[PDB]
Symmetry: D2
Subunit: 404 residues, 4 copies
């Protein structure tokens, strides 16, 4: 079955009534008829007992995301941040190191700096490229972390070669696939990534409504080489990793996704491939039409022939994707543009509305200047997350704003 | 205003339309009209930008819980577990120690063992009593953690004397007030606790519906003595602690409560004092009527005159409270009782339905035998969370089950 | 089982997972595996096919309301208004007459005037008292409609004697039991009413949140005497009436209650008896303390010894109930009182907040002056729907306002 | 702005916080600070007082549907059925006649037969074609009712010529635009229809989730000629019609849409044009590929060159649309096909899943045989509502089923 097919069918429960959709299990606990039945659900983890460990509505969304990313197993949690955090928490010990791409989401850098520091972990930031990664490896490296498309630098890493290196070094390649849109734009596991994390808040939801995140992994022998699975590997084989994300992330840290949120995210997936296709058509149109404009200092879009991302885009992404950036030259010209444009400015991505933001003063404002510049963030840069609006209507609004 | 008054009025928003209740802000992002407006909301944290940091619906529930616990500030998160974890994460550094009561919730022990170990922290478990705590203090102690009512041991710590000791040692007294029912049964901050954490899933919700948790703190000078607030103390004074729970727990770890869950929890608080009063009336009735029964080896209920908890209950709790336990003598007699009783068995508390559970095989099954016994869990023990049903109907069901 | 017991247990589904609560079936349609299976669900109405006819979440709320009102069958619909309308639509033909109490809810009078006029029906308004009803009967009378407690006149009809008369005349006694709080304060079916309708929006919900209504009926031979059940009586016996409310109200007019609303109403019932008891305790306290105040021209409360409603209250209601009125003497004094009182003014009832309103200018403003006066509405009258707040806090706010 | 643009922007509230989306006003009542403020909101209908009359969440969905259908005003209600019923209730008096197309939705025929009969109205059924309509006019005709695309006969009426005739006769042309997908496939008001009604449950929702309906009208002088607007026309001009649908449908009959449902429908509109385009691309592909198959007796699809609907489709619809039918020849061959096909059978339309149904035994089973045949329903007929799945995957499932 094709992605569009799986997206409306995968994960639908076998409802006793024939229900064509997903009931919302907004219930905290599940009862049992005897001491023994209770004892067996607690011992084996089968059946339900309490919603913080698992819930049938979240399970449907896991099964659908599993089908769409082509994974072994998915675990959903309260947000994208919670998923990045739970995945790393399940991998790492005090004294470990991570080798992380430089271009990362500002809260991933914040989480790495302020929380993984507390778990005793050090991070080395590098260009997400095999040789730079190689030369950062040490005896203590336990994970290589990159994003499918750097945001906002819009660089696409060579995933397959990074996965071969990670596999050869005995470490996990963890890919933040937030920009790959739950597999609709990219499926990093298919190229050899061991773990994907992502914010479902973005493209998967599609409506800038509620928060969710996911961790997914693939069948691999890697986890045999992590001591925490030697104290699970025998019992669970490659499922030992997602079971520990579950245990640590949900049972213990309690980062549980509401079944109301699971239900909305489950439905947003039904149109993700259609939406991402439309946004990316429009983004390529806007890229082509705006790149030669005199007031546009630089336009980055991975599907432009001469773009730096175009090589790796053509291999890993289904299209040029839904994001582009403009450099207006400086703060002053960005300001006038954003003040003039009759489109929303907000810090979200993958909404059905086209959204513009100034990373230097918002998404990346909690970082020092050097760190902004290293992430491809400059004072002229404006990021555009393209929505579902008519491409001619959008171009007219851009043109008009540029007149200001 | 009295608690019952505050519970239906506190935290109601000033709605532009006059709305008597709480709209659900199921929106991810908040837009701005200029580069500069965006930049100012990011710099100052005022106004809204993105739902993972804050949301008007969660804010209403914080303001109500603040009023009800009599706190300086509340922060809500995705679950009780997330709140215990975020509070400790905001307090602790690798190498710190915690001194924790022995009787604790099994997932709090699990979180301490499996996650706080990863943050480099060691825990010393003691009887929650001033001298045992005193003699456990070391140069590295950074927190004393107890529960308002030990579950299921039903012992009530001497909070005021523990708070005086913590204050004198320069460490935080953190109280899990899950059993104090959002201030309706106990307000630990009023006795000098620095921090309360709690599961709103339980009594506050009242319907065994959705998960939520809260962290609250009081005005105190203690945080001046924690280095992390010296790198905040000047800018924020006693609000530095809840601001860091927010930052670490929500911004970074992303343990965000859904606005659908906030809305349901906000409403459950409107009846918590009424429900807790009814449950506790009924629990005292069942305690009195069952304690002399020949098949009941031991009945614990804090409001029974000769109960070990009765001293500290009379001081700290509004009543004997909604929980009691029976010891049937052994596994075999517990089994027959639970199989025979025409009441639900499930692992939840503070639901409107009376719930029974066998801690030895469920809530405490992930602990070694010694740890079960030290928590007051034995193979004969059955815990009862008393709901809203008629007390005579309930007694008849107990009597009848005991015949088996 | 007692009412409080039934309210947390009745209508809980037999969930395949043991769920202790009610999943929300927010699904439009239910599928089938063969042409024949589809054909059989359509023929027999068994199983599910489409949410406008029936839905498992609404069914749970029907079963609980059935248990609580002590009915044969309940049907839920989108609002209290929809239920009054559907019930009458299932009873009446063009040319029929209704004999209706004078004191009625303003929208019931509006529905009777503006919509039942369109269905060809005439209404005779009378004092809700056996002899006045008797003398209004004609060959064309098809229903006697009264409210359990007139609002705001606070008169309680002699239900048992009205039901004996209706039964003797061969016509339905239809009781709006909105004030009887889903059976917690009154159960009209138990006294011989054939049909109850009510707004669940009010006391049953308890949180001034979402709209719902219900129609319920009892086992009776009456429907054999209505021709529409002779074209059903044989097949369904006393269930012919609720089946037709379903068919006309839901299948055809499509007045369907959302499963999100059913879920919230199902939970509000879990505390209705506790809330109604508390409100009514407080209302009796406020009645007693305010009735002798010099600025209070008249105070009506059914549980006051000398009140006109007290006779019939003592027989039919569980207590004096949660509503009282004050007459300030005139418009000018009502105005100052309501402007001065630090309590909410809004047009809703049975919320957890005490609510005040001026019927002459609001709830009854769409009626001519004569009709207001006949409903017990005067320019001095203020209606109080007592909430869950502390009674001393409330009395202080009243006293203080009266100073103005 | 183009339809796709309006669909993500129209109706977004001016939120005090900048919220990019729609808060859910799950609140029953709106308070006021003085007797006078209350009195003025009741007199003028401005501002809010009680959710049965209006609610900010429903208002956003009305404003968006207004923009998308290009209407004067929209009113939302609990279901498609409620909207058809409320619209006619606002138009008609006892003794009026309606002239209605023969091919109609089975519940519209049921509503006409079983409920409009109770309002004293007679219906004449005709081919939805100017001359047949003309010759059915009488002095008593008050409305001509047709559906944008007959279901399942798939005939498209000549709307513009029907609107010219209705306008010339002084009667309303009421169009059920359920198949025109909230204006994405057809906008009947743009061709001169006076009133549109539709089920938002179908294409607008897009997820087979919750029920909603809408009534919309256009600026017209027609309502001056209806006596009920002469007792409103002066005060409100063409808005007198939607104000009366509101008053009768919502204030009085209480057919109110839940704000949870409004919120889900508001979001489903954001992708309706994209979804309808994809479904209709796929439907045309399946039409073309299946029409020559030997086991397919007849295939109807409006976008096939020689189809009977193709003339009027090319004028009124944006494409061939998302529905097609197959005639398998008889009951026995339909049965084998439907039993064999690995696609869902359910009675819903415009879901993201492709749905098949056998109208003779389901959607039209409550009609006599003659009425089925007159609606284009035969024992061989299978209706397909095309979803979002891959067209090659779908064709393979059809081909395979036809082998059976
Ligand atoms: C937004 C985002 C996240 C975080 O997800 P939330 O649900 O917002 O926590 C993580 N990674 C990337 C690339 C993101 O864009
Ligand atoms: C249930 C419970 C928790 C955890 O809360 P969740 O919302 O269930 O995580 C924490 N402490 C105590 C005492 C509890 O009983
Ligand atoms: C409020 C009320 C109604 C109507 O119910 P809604 O859900 O508001 O339509 C009907 N009867 C009485 C007495 C009411 O008070
Ligand atoms: C389904 C449908 C309706 C009714 O809408 P509900 O929301 O299901 O009542 C009305 N007209 C047509 C053509 C329909 O298909």
């Amino acid at each position: 079955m094709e992605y569009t097919t799986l997206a409306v069918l995968a994960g639908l429960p076998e409802d006793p009534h024939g229900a064509v959709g997903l009931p919302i299990y907004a219930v905290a606990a599940y009862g049992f008829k005897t001491l023994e039945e209770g004892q067996e659900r607690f011992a084996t983890g089968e059946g339900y007992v309490y919603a913080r460990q698992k819930d049938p509505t979240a399970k449907a969304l896991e099964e659908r995301l599993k089908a769409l990313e082509g994974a072994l197993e998915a675990v959903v949690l309260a947000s994208g941040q919670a998923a990045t955090f739970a995945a790393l928490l399940a991998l790492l010990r005090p004294g470990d190191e991570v080798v992380a791409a430089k271009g990362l989401f500002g809260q991933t850098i914040g989480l790495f700096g302020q929380v993984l520091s507390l778990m005793g972990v050090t991070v080395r930031y590098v260009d997400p490229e095999p040789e730079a990664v190689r030369e950062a490896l040490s005896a203590k490296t336990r994970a290589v972390f990159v994003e499918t498309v750097a945001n906002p630098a819009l660089l696409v890493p060579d995933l397959e070669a990074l996965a071969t290196l990670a596999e050869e070094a005995g470490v996990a390649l963890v890919v933040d696939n937030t920009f790959g849109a739950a597999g609709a734009l990219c499926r990093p596991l298919a190229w050899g990534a061991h773990v994907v994390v992502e914010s479902l808040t973005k493209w998967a939801s599609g409506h800038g409504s509620v928060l969710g995140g996911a961790v997914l992994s693939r069948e691999t022998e890697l986890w045999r080489n992590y001591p925490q699975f030697l104290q699970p590997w025998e019992a669970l084989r490659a499922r030992c990793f997602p079971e520990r994300v579950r245990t640590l992330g949900l049972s213990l840290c309690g980062m549980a996704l509401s079944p109301f949120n699971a239900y909305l995210l489950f439905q947003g997936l039904e149109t993700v491939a259609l939406r991402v296709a439309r946004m990316s058509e429009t983004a390529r149109f806007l890229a082509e039409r705006l790149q030669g404009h005199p007031k546009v200092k630089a336009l980055r879009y991975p599907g432009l022939p001469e773009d730096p991302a175009h090589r790796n885009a053509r291999k890993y992404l289904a299209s040029g994707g839904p994001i582009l950036t403009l450099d207006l030259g400086d703060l002053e010209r960005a300001s006038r543009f954003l003040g003039a444009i009759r489109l929303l400015k907000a810090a979200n991505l993958g909404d059905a509305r086209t959204l513009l933001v100034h990373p230097w003063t918002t998404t990346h404002s909690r970082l020092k200047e050097e760190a902004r510049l290293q992430a491809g963030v400059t004072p002229g840069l404006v990021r555009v997350s393209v929505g579902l609006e008519d491409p001619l209507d959008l171009l007219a609004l851009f043109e008009e704003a540029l007149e200001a």
